[PDB]
C-alpha cells in the first residue's frame, strides 16, 4: 500500500491516510480501531518506553555506566537509547501493517552480526527488549500505572499477543 512505498522510497517522505482511505486501511487488518489505538499507545509513549527499558537494563547491571562500561559515555548511552527506539518503531510499524516483514528485513537482518562486531552485549539487549515488550503489553492492556490511556473499555488481548510475537522475533534474532 501507500505506506509500503514510503518505506521503500528513496527519501522516505511522509504519506498520510484519512477519510475513506483510512476506512479502507482498517478493513485489510484485523480489529482496525483497537489496532490504531495500540500503535498510538506505542508511539505516543516512545520516550517513556525506551527510557524505562534501557534504565531497567542498567539498574539490573550498574557496571554498564561505570568506567569500562558499555554505556559509560553519554555518546554510547544515547546510541543505545536510539537503537531501542529504532527497534520499537519497527515494531510499531509491524503492528500497524499486520506483519513483520519490514522489521525482519530492514531492522533485524544483519543486526546480530553488527552488534557482535561492535561489542554490543547480547544479554543487555535481551533485557532491554524483554522490558520493552512487557512495557508495550502493559500499555496495550491497561496495566500502565502512571499513564492511563483513553480508550473505550474492552479486550485488546489479541493485539497484545500479536505485538508480543514481533518482540519475540527481535529477541530470537539477537540472542
Amino acid at each position: 500500500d501507500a505506506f509500503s512505498k514510503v518505506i521503500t522510497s528513496a527519501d522516505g517522505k511522509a504519506a498520510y491516510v484519512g477519510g475513506a482511505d483510512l476506512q479502507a486501511l482498517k478493513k485489510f487488518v484485523s480489529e482496525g480501531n483497537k489496532r490504531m489505538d495500540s500503535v498510538n499507545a506505542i508511539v505516543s509513549n516512545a520516550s517513556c518506553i525506551v527510557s524505562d527499558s534501557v534504565s531497567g537494563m542498567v539498574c539490573e547491571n550498574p557496571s554498564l555506566i561505570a568506567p569500562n562500561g558499555g554505556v559509560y559515555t553519554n555518546r554510547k548511552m544515547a546510541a543505545c537509547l536510539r537503537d531501542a527506539e529504532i527497534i520499537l518503531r519497527y515494531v510499531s510499524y509491524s503492528l500497524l501493517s499486520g506483519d513483520s516483514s519490514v522489521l525482519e528485513d530492514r531492522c533485524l537482518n544483519g543486526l546480530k552480526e553488527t552488534y557482535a562486531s561492535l561489542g554490543v552485549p547480547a544479554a543487555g539487549n535481551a533485557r532491554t527488549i524483554s522490558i520493552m515488550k512487557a512495557t508495550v503489553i502493559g500499555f496495550i492492556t491497561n496495566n500502565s500505572q502512571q499513564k492511563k490511556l483513553s480508550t473505550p473499555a474492552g479486550d485488546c488481548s489479541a493485539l497484545a499477543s500479536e505485538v508480543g510475537g514481533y518482540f519475540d522475533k527481535v529477541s530470537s534474532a539477537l540472542a
Binding site: A20, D52, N74, D105
Partner: protein, 72 residues
C-alpha cells in the same frame, strides 16, 4: 538488510475528535472519519533536532535516575 543508516518508520496516529484540528494533510476529516489520520515517514532516528537534544537529555537522565521506576 539492516543498512546502518538508523532510518526507521515513524508512525503517527492522530485522534483530534475533540474538535481542535491540526494542519490538513489528507482528505477525509469529515463524516465518520472526522479527526482521524495516520502518517508514516521513513527517516533517521536522530539524537536531536531543531536545537533540542532529545536523546542526550534521555541519556543524562538514565545515568542519574536508572534506580527510579517511572512506571509506578
Amino acid at each position: 538488510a539492516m543498512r546502518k543508516d538508523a532510518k526507521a518508520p515513524y508512525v503517527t496516529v492522530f485522534d483530534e475528535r475533540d474538535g481542535c484540528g491540526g494542519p490538513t494533510k489528507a482528505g477525509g476529516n469529515s463524516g465518520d472519519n472526522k479527526g482521524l489520520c495516520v502518517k508514516v515517514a521513513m527517516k533517521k532516528v536522530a539524537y536531536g533536532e531543531g536545537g533540542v537534544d532529545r536523546i542526550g537529555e534521555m541519556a543524562r537522565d538514565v545515568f542519574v535516575n536508572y534506580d527510579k521506576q517511572r512506571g509506578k
